[PDB]
């Protein structure tokens, strides 16, 4: 009934936890605040796959 | 707004009155307008009332806005508790805030002041400005581990 999916370091079984992040390489439009010199931004997070 | 108001017979009866409600605030140009009562107009911005109608008009405007917070949740607190808090903010002449760059910039000792926030930075300036502490504060005697002037400690006890 053990399911696996864990490493065994120093006898203490460890689980790599999932890590949420925004997707890279997408164009997103972000309305800036009213006390701001710039009004709109188009952000693209650029990193190689 | 419904409102009870005295009848000529003397018993209170409800006289309905039309009351405008706005989205913005400028007292200096709104109360000086024909067709309104400039003696009873109200904002929920006590900071505007303090600079326009005098400080002591802001004190009652401060307390009423605290009351509407409590009574919206249905609760009830006695008058003296909030009115103590309002008077402490109001006594200094402006609107002393209950925050780290508010009341805590007073002359109320140093060990009392160092116990709230910006702890080490206050002792630095007191080491420069050579402050002397009265040690009548509660937190001065708590830090020094003495019987503070707290009820029981307000008076000395001696024999006949």
């Amino acid at each position: 009934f053990d399911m696996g999916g864990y490493f065994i370091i120093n006898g203490s079984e460890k689980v790599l936890i999932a890590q949420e992040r925004s997707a890279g390489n997408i164009v997103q439009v972000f309305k800036k605040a009213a006390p701001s010199p710039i009004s709109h931004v188009a952000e693209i997070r650029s990193a190689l796959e | 707004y419904d409102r009870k108001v005295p009848s000529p017979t003397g018993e209170y009866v409800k006289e309905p009155e039309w009351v405008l409600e706005t989205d913005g605030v400028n007292l200096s140009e709104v109360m000086t307008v024909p067709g309104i009562d400039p003696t009873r107009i109200y904002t929920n911005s006590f900071i505007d009332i303090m600079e326009v109608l005098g400080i002591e008009a802001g004190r009652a405007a401060l307390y009423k806005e605290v009351y509407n917070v409590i009574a919206s949740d249905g609760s009830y607190v006695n008058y003296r508790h909030m009115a103590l808090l309002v008077d402490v903010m109001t006594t200094q002449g402006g609107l002393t805030s209950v925050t780290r760059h508010g009341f805590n910039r007073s002359n109320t000792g140093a060990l009392m002041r160092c116990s709230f926030e910006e702890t080490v930075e206050i002792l630095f300036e007191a080491g420069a400005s050579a402050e002397l502490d009265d040690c009548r504060g509660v937190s001065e005697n708590v830090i020094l581990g003495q019987m503070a002037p707290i009820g029981t400690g307000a008076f000395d006890v001696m024999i006949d």
Binding site: - | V138, V142, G145, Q146, M147, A148, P149, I150, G151, T152
Partner: protein, 196 residues
Amino acid sequence: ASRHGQKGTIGITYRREDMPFTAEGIVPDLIINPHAIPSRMTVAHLIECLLSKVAALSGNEGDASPFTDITVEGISKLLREHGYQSRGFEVMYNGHTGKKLMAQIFFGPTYYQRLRHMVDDKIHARARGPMQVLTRQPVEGRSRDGGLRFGEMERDCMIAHGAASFLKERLMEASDAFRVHICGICGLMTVIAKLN
């Protein structure tokens, strides 16, 4: 606790005689209180007690799957086939007296979970125990025979009471009263400690 956020510690252990009984001699393993039902709105707890009760008598499994077309009225048709009240009530008798209880009792099996919080694993008491090295204060945690914090959040409460001598006791005689000597000219503890 149960499977519906219904927690609760054990208030008392009663024996079988002191426990109320029904006309079949059945006795509740566990007694909860009806006021924890309407505040948190755990109706599934109430249907689980019903669906388990029909499952025990019929010998068939209980389908508690979400988004089923199983109804309370459909379950309560089955429990009336097995000679009980449709909504789970049972005439129960007091154990101390034997008089029939004036309110008929909601009775049935319900899956309960024994959580990992045990009292003797949390029992902690201390007087004049170990001291921390740096601050001469009591050490942390019950695992080291430590002392409870008389925090500043609690110091305000004793201030409001006006108990001043208790405040000096809780901060000196307990936890790190220390004597030191200072000079009358320079107000600092520079002076060589000379006692005997």
